[PDB]
């Protein structure tokens, strides 16, 4: 008989409320059975009882490490259904904060992966940088993480009068912190022993199982949604896409580090190219007017009242909108029946498919290797369970 | 436009082989990692002396809710119920009637602070700047009931925090 | 920053880099916590003339999906969903890490 073991939910390596039922012969893993749903909150039904603006803060709490990226995907879906266009300055702000968010997510992923493996130190070095980016979030929206800044019309508020300078000051020091992380990990023989040839997935298998993002790029597949299906102003920035060679945990780690560097590159470009103008679509039947207009003009007051009580109506139709979120392809299948409430909202999270493939990726490995594989899949269970 | 992260081949000359043998036998990269940690030991820690020292915040910061007044001392809230309609958590409960002088005022104004997500949508929706999220964040209670705010509690919060709330609004209202 | 120069030398030697050049604590180069007021430019629809809403109504230009091949109702060269993707180029900046 194989030993049957509960891995989580109350486990440090679990990375959330995961009940990994594991069959083991000695420490060899014979079978992985991920039991999820310990963080299923019934988000999609709730979204059905809300208006389109009331449903936005749910996308903050889907993947709690990539908040604005989740907001951007939902906003793109709703804007596509509304047949409107965000203004250019809003799109530049969106891309800038999406890259800052990608930095946040990649720091969290790499350091928690190292912490599982046993290298506890880089976490503390990188979480101070995460703290400074949380400060950027807070200055723009008043919240450290669940900002709700990106709205289906653009962004809620314009940047405060000295934010770009501080973002520049942060961005010109971050590369040295990445360098210190790489000094700790990249050439360590212990880290390579714990990561090289662990959780190897082929290109064909990665495509069929539904993988996306780094889980594809580590296996040599050349696919990045920002390059192939660009959104906002991603076609106007220059960056390279890291590609792996072996499909293992080590290659995925290198891809994420290089991705962090390329995000610094994109941020530098966005800082030097931010244009002037308004921040939300100049269409008061979709985006609320300014407060001075709301307090002086009859139409502005009527539209403020109606947008905050009933909300805008969205013409009937269904869309599937996908973005390159820091964890992979993040999608929304949004169905509108013509009213101000969404009829259906299905959320596609890359972690769902990655966790469904965890059992495949752990064949012939031990317990510690399974811990490394869970770390390398970059799983947050808010997006998996919803 | 792409780059490779692990497609480099190692040199096979005798010098390179001897350098790699020295790396294997004398553990050079491990000493590199030790040097990095030793370097961090001599830096100044990023720790702050809480509660004496506080983390930086912004005028846009979302905290505990408060109900404000006009400079005359009259309440700003007119019971339009836009905050109650917009609240994604349904955390606001409002009941209203004509006041003794015929004014349109609330008789019940509750916020369930354990339902609230602290999104700030209500202060955006308020047309008279009556409901705000003030700057306070240190209001942990010992019981659940203390976090079920009625109109008296919110008016008291407004009275207690008006000096800072008005200064925060003055610094941010031109972005709104 | 503020520390002894011998400790700075030891830090630089152990880390291998000049630490002082890129300090991770923000000493005084960050923006002031009080700023002048902004002015914020208005949008393109803030015109006083020639601004009828029916000419800038994006919601009302959405239409039901176009129907191809209802079942209820030449060589003919084969076709694909879209032209094949061009192969990627290898990063003239830094092709190999």
């Amino acid at each position: 008989s194989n030993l049957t073991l509960n891995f989580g939910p109350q486990h440090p390596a679990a990375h959330g409320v995961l009940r990994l039922v594991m069959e083991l012969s000695g420490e060899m893993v014979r079978k992985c059975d991920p039991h999820i749903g310990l963080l299923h909150r019934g988000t999609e039904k709730l979204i059905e009882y809300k208006t389109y603006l009331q449903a936005l803060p749910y996308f903050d709490r889907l993947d709690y490490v990539s908040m604005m990226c989740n907001e951007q995907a939902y906003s793109l879906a709703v804007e596509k259904l509304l047949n409107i266009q965000p203004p250019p300055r809003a799109q530049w702000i969106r891309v800038l904060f999406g890259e800052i968010t990608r930095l946040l997510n990649h720091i969290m992923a790499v350091t928690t992966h190292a912490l599982d493996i046993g290298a506890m130190t880089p976490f503390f070095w990188m979480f101070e940088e995460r703290e400074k980016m949380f400060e950027f979030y807070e200055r723009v929206s008043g919240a450290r993480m669940h900002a709700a800044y990106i709205r289906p019309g653009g962004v809620h508020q314009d940047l405060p009068l000295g934010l770009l300078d501080d973002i520049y000051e942060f961005s010109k020091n971050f590369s040295f912190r990445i360098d210190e992380l790489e000094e700790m990990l990249t050439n360590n023989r212990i880290w390579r022993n714990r990561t090289v040839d662990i959780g190897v997935v082929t290109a064909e298998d990665a495509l069929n199982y539904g993988f996306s993002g780094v889980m594809l790029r580590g296996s040599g597949i050349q696919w990045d949604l920002r390059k192939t299906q660009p959104y906002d102003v991603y076609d106007q920035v220059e960056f390279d896409v890291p590609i792996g060679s072996r499909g293992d945990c080590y290659d995925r780690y290198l891809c994420r580090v290089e991705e962090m560097r390329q995000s610094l590159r994109i941020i530098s470009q966005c800082l030097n190219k931010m244009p002037p103008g308004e921040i939300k679509v100049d269409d008061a039947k979709v985006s609320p007017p300014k407060r001075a207009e709301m307090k002086t003009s009859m139409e502005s007051l009527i539209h403020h009242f109606k947008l905050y009580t009933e909300g805008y109506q969205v013409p009937p139709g269904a869309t599937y909108t996908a973005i390159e979120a820091p964890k992979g392809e993040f999608g929304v299948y949004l169905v509108s029946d013509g009213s101000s409430r969404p009829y259906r909202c299905k959320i596609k999270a890359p972690g769902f498919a990655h966790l469904a493939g965890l059992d495949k990726m752990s064949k012939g490995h031990m317990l510690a290797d399974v811990v490394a594989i869970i770390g390398t899949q970059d799983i947050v269970f808010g997006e998996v369970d919803r | 436009t792409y780059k490779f992260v692990n497609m480099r081949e190692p040199s096979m000359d005798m010098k390179s082989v001897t350098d790699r043998a020295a790396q294997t036998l004398l553990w050079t990269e491990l000493v590199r990692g030790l040097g990095m940690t030793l370097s961090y030991l001599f830096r100044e820690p990023a720790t702050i002396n809480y509660p004496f020292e506080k983390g930086p915040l912004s005028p846009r910061f979302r905290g505990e809710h408060a109900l404000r007044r006009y400079p005359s001392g009259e309440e700003r809230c007119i019971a339009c119920k836009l905050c109650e309609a917009v609240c994604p958590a349904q955390a606001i409960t409002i009941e209203a009637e004509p006041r003794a002088d015929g004014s349109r005022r609330t008789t019940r104004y509750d916020i369930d602070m354990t339902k609230c997500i602290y999104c700030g949508f209500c202060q955006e929706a308020c047309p008279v700047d009556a409901i705000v999220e003030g700057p306070n964040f240190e209001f942990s209670t010992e019981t659940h009931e203390e976090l079920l705010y009625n109109k008296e509690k919110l008016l008291n919060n407004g009275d207690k925090w008006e000096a800072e709330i008005a200064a925060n609004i003055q610094a941010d209202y031109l972005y709104r | 920053a503020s520390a002894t120069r011998v400790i700075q030398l030891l830090r630089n030697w152990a880390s291998g880099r000049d630490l002082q050049a890129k300090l991770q604590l923000r000493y005084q180069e960050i923006s002031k916590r009080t700023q002048p007021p902004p002015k914020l430019p208005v949008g393109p629809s803030h015109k006083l003339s020639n601004n009828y809403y029916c000419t800038r109504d994006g919601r009302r230009e959405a239409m039901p999906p176009s129907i191809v091949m209802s079942s209820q109702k030449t060589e003919k060269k084969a076709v694909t969903p879209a032209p094949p993707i061009k192969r990627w180029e290898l990063s003239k900046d830094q092709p190999y890490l």
Partner: peptide
């Protein structure tokens, strides 16, 4: 008649930001 004031990059541009990996050799033979 006040002019538009808005958070923008300074005239010309911001100073260049390093992003490439910097791992020195740092050893004997």
């Amino acid at each position: 008649a006040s002019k538009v004031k808005q958070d923008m990059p300074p005239p010309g541009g911001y100073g260049p930001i390093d992003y490439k990996r910097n791992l020195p050799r740092r050893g004997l033979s």
